Amino acid sequence: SESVPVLELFSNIWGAGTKTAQMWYQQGFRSLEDIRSQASLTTQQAIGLKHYSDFLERMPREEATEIEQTVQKAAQAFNSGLLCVACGSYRRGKATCGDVDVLITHPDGRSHRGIFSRLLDSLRQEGFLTDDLVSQEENGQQQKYLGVCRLPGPGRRHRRLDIIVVPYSEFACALLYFTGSAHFNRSMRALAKTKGMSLSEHALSTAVVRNTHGCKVGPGRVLPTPTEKDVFRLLGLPYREPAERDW
DNA sequence: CAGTAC
DNA sequence: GTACTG
After folding, report:
1. Where is the segment annotated DNA-binding?
2. Nucleotide nearest to A181 (CA to C1')
3. Which positions on chain C have an atom < 7 Å from some protein CB?
């Protein structure tokens, strides 16, 4: 086909962006089969190619819910203290979802530790997790898993699933980051910068030092933020509900 | 870099 | 914007 369309097609493989799609184009590849048979794939790109059709579909809210529940049940078995919340589009209340992002913490502030591997291992035994894409354990106290699940029974599609485990200390900022939206997060972070602060999935910080070109050269003090509302407050912002964050 | 997460 | 691994 024409160049713009083939680039779009390749681009829709998880793990491949413009640069990879152009490289594959120059190799002479024009179809997904070409890629599957001749291209050098990353483990992740291989999985994205396998689930290429499925990953293109959004899912109904119901399925997202069902998926969060599947995760919730497994985690709770370890500790019923655990709190699991589905974020992303779901929290924002959208009708359909592209993926499910499940945030996890313990009000305890302690018991959340050591759940991450077990939870994953448990979900693997169950047949629920089908492929693994990325694991992040260099997140300080947050662990992120990016993967692929599939609900039991016939006619079910492979869905993209993220699972994050954070300390209660940072629940608010994590919650805030994971429900987004992306354009929304960009806006609060931009704003904070203006006020001499910084925002991340870990903390809001004040007294952030910056130089003449604007570059962060000093971390601030971390401001305790037990709820999302505390974050909006300290930034001098009317609070907004997740559905109001769908920018 | 590239691709990804929101 | 912030920040992770491939």
Report:
1. 17-20, 138-177
2. B6
3. 1-6
As a rounded value in angstroms, the CA-to-C1' distance for A144 and B5 is 10
Annotated binding site of A: 58, 89-92, 98-101, 162, 185
- Residue A234's CB is within 10 A of a number of other CB atoms, namely 17
Residue A55 has which token pair? 């990953």
Instruction: Find out whether A174 and A164 touch, Cβ atoms under 8 Å.
Output: yes
Flag residues 24-63 of A with CB < 7 Å from strand C: 42-44
Looking at residue A239, its amino acid is Y
The CATH architecture annotation of domain A58-180 reads 2-Layer Sandwich (3.30)
As a CATH number, domain A1-57 is 1.10.150.20
A204 closest CA partner among A238, A166, A170, A178: A170
Question: What is the CA A58 to C1' B4 distance in angstroms?
Answer: 18
Is A199's CB less than 7 Å from nucleic acid strand C?
Answer: yes
State the structure-solving technique. X-ray
The length of chain A, given as a count of residues: 247
Q: Are A35 and A154 in contact (CB under 8 A)?
A: no
Structure tokens at A40: 């050098």
Whether omega for the bond prior to residue A31 falls within 30 degrees of 0, making it cis, is no
Q: Which residues are within 8 A (CB) of A99 and not within 5 positions of it... i.e. 6 or more apart? A: A88, A159, A160, A161, A162
Strand A99-105 to strand A159-165: parallel, antiparallel, or no bridges (unpaired)? parallel
